Amino acid sequence: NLYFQHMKHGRVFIIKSYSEDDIHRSIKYNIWCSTEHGNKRLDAAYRSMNGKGPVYLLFSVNGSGHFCGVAEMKSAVDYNTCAGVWSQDKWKGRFDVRWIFVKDVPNSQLRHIRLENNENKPVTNSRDTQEVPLEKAKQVLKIIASYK
Numbered sequence: 001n002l003y004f005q006h007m008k009h010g011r012v013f014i015i016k017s018y019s020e021d022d023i024h025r026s027i028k029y030n031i032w033c034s035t036e037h038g039n040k041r042l043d044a045a046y047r048s049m050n051g052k053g054p055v056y057l058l059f060s061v062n063g064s065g066h067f068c069g070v071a072e073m074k075s076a077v078d079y080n081t082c083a084g085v086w087s088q089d090k091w092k093g094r095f096d097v098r099w100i101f102v103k104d105v106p107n108s109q110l111r112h113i114r115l116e117n118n119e120n121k122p123v124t125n126s127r128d129t130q131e132v133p134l135e136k137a138k139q140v141l142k143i144i145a146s147y148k
């Protein structure tokens with residue numbers, strides 16, 4: 001899948017989900033919510049983008065050993081929400097997402113990609129809302145898209 005090899009715009013973030021049930025709910029309802037600090041980071045990136053390129057999210061459940069898919073941010077963060085929707089009751093907030101890949105990709109396939117903005121650590125050792133440089137994100141996206 002040579003599609004992503006020539007991407008010229010966009011920002012890309014890691015999402016770490018404590019719960020696979022929350023991944024299921026995100027796919028069913030096309031929504032996500034991060035922590036307070038994570039929501040602020042994603043909101044800033046989405047808003048400054050002003051629709052000039054995509055914001056992609058690379059999802060992985062904590063401790064699972066694999067990534068589980070890719071979604072595009074499709075709205076700014078709405079902070080005026082009901083509590084208790086997600087795996088920890090305190091998280092409020094919501095933004096729309098569109099899932100573009102739902103597939104398990106082992107960390108072994110992605111570990112060789114290092115993030116020069118994060119001490120050259122493997123992309124598989126990232127924390128929630130770690131940003132991925134575009135040239136490294138393109139390599140992750142090609143691998144996820146091509147994996148079978």
Ligand SMILES: Cc1nc(=O)c(C)n[nH]1
Binds near residue numbers: 016017019087
């Ligand atoms: C739904 C959800 N799970 C999480 O573990 C985090 C960090 N943010 N949002």
